[PDB]
Amino acid sequence: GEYPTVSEIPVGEVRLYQIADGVWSHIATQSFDGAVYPSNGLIVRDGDELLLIDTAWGAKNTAALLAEIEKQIGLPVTRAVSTHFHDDRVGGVDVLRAAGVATYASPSTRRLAEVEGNEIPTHSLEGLSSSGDAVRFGPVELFYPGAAHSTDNLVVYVPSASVLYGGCAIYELSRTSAGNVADADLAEWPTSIERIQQHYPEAQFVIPGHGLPGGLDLLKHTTNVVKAHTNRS
Ligand SMILES: [C]N1C(C(F)(F)F)=NN2=[C@@]1([S])[O-]2
Ligand SMILES: *C1(C(F)(F)F)=NN=C([S])N1(*)[C]
Ligand SMILES: [Cl-]
Ligand SMILES: [Zn+2]
Ligand SMILES: [Zn+2]
Ligand SMILES: [Zn+2]
């Protein structure tokens, strides 16, 4: 396993990891309350351009992300999708926009970002408003599994590569306790995860919002952690 961790990534830097032909994750680090967290997004080749999924958690990181993509891949990022409204997913949208990247999110995400005072993707993704809804967006399928980590969270599937990117609705195996769930729907989260399993049973690579990739085993792991948190006392 050659996936990078926080020790191999000074804050302000970004690593790319090739998961499959024409599919990468981008990995960045960010500090919070004296601890350092890794964070994942996705990059998907579409012909001679690139689709970006999520920012690198801030303006500085996201600029570094664009510089690393150009250095290592050398194809233009034409579109970006943010998978929910929190700052680690839309933080850096203004940088993308300034660089000429068309930015996208569901209308639900755009609204919530606005309420939070966060950066707001330009474009609104139709067809994702009800749990179980999917739309094609270039080389990926976008799926709204229902509320989980947030009410607006999306997941992304790359059918050519069998790569499922769960964003912050899916926990890495090393995470044994609930993360930040201030905006979560704990009641619905397991149900939302099971929709993901039902829709992508053939997924071979599962990328959590933070940390190490794995397989579909990450879904039940996440459900277990969420349910234990639910019963907390
Ligand atoms: C990490 N995270 C966040 C912040 F804001 F803190 F950054 N949000 N959500 C999560 S997971 O996403
Ligand atoms: C763009 C482009 F062309 F990719 F830059 N900007 N807004 C929309 S919609 N598109 C396709
Ligand atoms: Cl645009
Ligand atoms: Zn979040
Ligand atoms: Zn546009
Ligand atoms: Zn996150």
Side-chain angles (χ1 to χ4, degrees):
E2 303 191 17
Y3 203 83
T5 67
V6 296
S7 296
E8 296 72 28
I9 309 174
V11 171
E13 292 183 28
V14 177
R15 293 293 116 87
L16 311 177
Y17 179 85
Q18 191 161 345
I19 301 161
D21 183 28
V23 186
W24 302 259
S25 63
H26 60 87
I27 308 100
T29 65
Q30 188 60 262
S31 298
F32 166 66
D33 283 354
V36 176
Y37 299 79
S39 182
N40 298 317
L42 214 68
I43 304 163
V44 185
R45 184 170 185 167
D46 185 24
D48 297 334
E49 41 193 78
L50 300 178
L51 178 60
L52 180 65
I53 312 294
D54 289 325
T55 68
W57 193 351
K60 177 184 184 70
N61 284 352
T62 300
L65 167 63
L66 290 179
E68 190 68 32
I69 289 170
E70 181 62 13
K71 169 173 172 179
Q72 206 165 326
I73 303 179
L75 297 177
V77 178
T78 56
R79 298 187 293 179
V81 172
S82 292
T83 58
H84 75 274
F85 73 99
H86 286 159
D87 197 52
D88 66 318
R89 305 302 158 183
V90 296
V93 153
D94 281 2
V95 159
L96 297 171
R97 179 155 43 222
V101 183
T103 57
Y104 299 76
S106 78
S108 185
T109 291
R110 296 183 63 260
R111 182 177 301 104
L112 285 163
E114 187 168 73
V115 173
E116 200 78 7
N118 293 350
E119 295 153 69
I120 306 167
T122 295
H123 288 282
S124 297
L125 297 165
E126 304 290 347
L128 292 165
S129 70
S130 303
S131 303
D133 283 351
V135 302
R136 193 71 190 236
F137 195 79
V140 307
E141 187 171 73
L142 305 179
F143 185 69
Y144 173 52
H149 168 77
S150 61
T151 65
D152 62 318
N153 49 207
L154 302 181
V155 303
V156 181
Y157 190 63
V158 189
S160 70
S162 304
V163 173
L164 176 68
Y165 171 70
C168 316
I170 304 299
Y171 288 179
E172 78 168 309
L173 294 184
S174 291
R175 180 172 265 157
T176 188
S177 66
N180 188 89
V181 298
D183 295 326
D185 193 317
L186 296 172
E188 289 299 329
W189 194 333
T191 296
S192 300
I193 284 176
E194 181 55 32
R195 294 198 184 86
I196 301 170
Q197 167 65 54
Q198 286 296 311
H199 210 82
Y200 303 114
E202 74 280 23
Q204 291 300 303
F205 309 92
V206 179
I207 313 308
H210 309 271
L212 267 54
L216 283 162
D217 43 310
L218 274 59
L219 277 61
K220 282 169 186 189
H221 163 72
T222 300
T223 289
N224 287 349
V225 170
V226 166
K227 286 190 185 196
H229 184 73
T230 293
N231 287 343
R232 81 188 179 282
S233 161

